[PDB]
Each structure stands twice: as structure tokens, then as C-alpha cells.
Structure 1
Amino acid sequence: AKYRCGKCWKELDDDQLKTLPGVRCPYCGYRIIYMVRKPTVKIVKAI
């Protein structure tokens, strides 16, 4: 899916298409990336 660079918390977004020899942010060269919230309406009951 889509990822987000871990440096400075919410840095920038990248996708599957960035094929690199290792897990690395193409922009800042950071080795930790996270996953996006999969934009979709989520229903939660205010109980």
C-alpha cells in the first residue's frame, strides 16, 4: 500500500513502487517507515 517516512514523525509519503535494495526512505534515507490509515469511512459508536 502506501507508507510514510518515520523521520520527524509525519515526514512524507511513499508507495510500493519505490523498489530499492533495502527498506529505506528514498528522500531522507531513513530505515523506518510506517503504514497509512487506508482512507475509508470508519464507524465508531460513541458509547
Structure 2
Amino acid sequence: AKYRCGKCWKELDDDQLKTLPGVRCPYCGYRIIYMVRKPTVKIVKAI
């Protein structure tokens, strides 16, 4: 799984293999991270 450290809408991306004592951003230590949207192509009907 690919996450994203959330200090704003976008920050540095981190992945699941980075194992730590708990859930935290490795680069800045923030305690809230968010899942990114997978690159699968999505079809939306334009009605």
C-alpha cells in the first residue's frame, strides 16, 4: 500500500515497507497519513 503524509493536501509519499514503532511520517514525524488513489483507470459516465 502507498500512503501520503498529510500536513496539507499533498506531501512526500511513503510506502508500507517502512516499518516504525507506530504510524508516523518518517520524514517529519506527523501522526496522520492518508492512502493515495491507485493508478487504475476509472470510467465515469458523464450524465
TM range (shorter): over 0.9
% identical aligned pairs: 100
> TM-score scaled by structure 1?
0.93
- Structure 1 or 2: more strand by fraction: 1
**Matches of 1:42 and 1:10, distance apart in 2:** 21
Residue segments in structure 2 that go unaligned for 5+ positions in a row: none
RMSD: 0.7
Deviation of residue 8 (structure 1)? 2.7
Q: CA deviation at 1:25?
A: 0.2
Q: Deviations along 1:1-47, whole A, 9 cap, x unmatched?
A: 00000113311100011100010000000000000001110000001
Distance (whole Å) between structure 2 residues aligned to residue 36 and residue 27 of structure 1: 17
Runs ≥4 in structure 1, deviation > 2 angstroms? none
Count of aligned positions:
47
| Runs of 5+ consecutive residues of structure 1 not aligned to the other structure | none
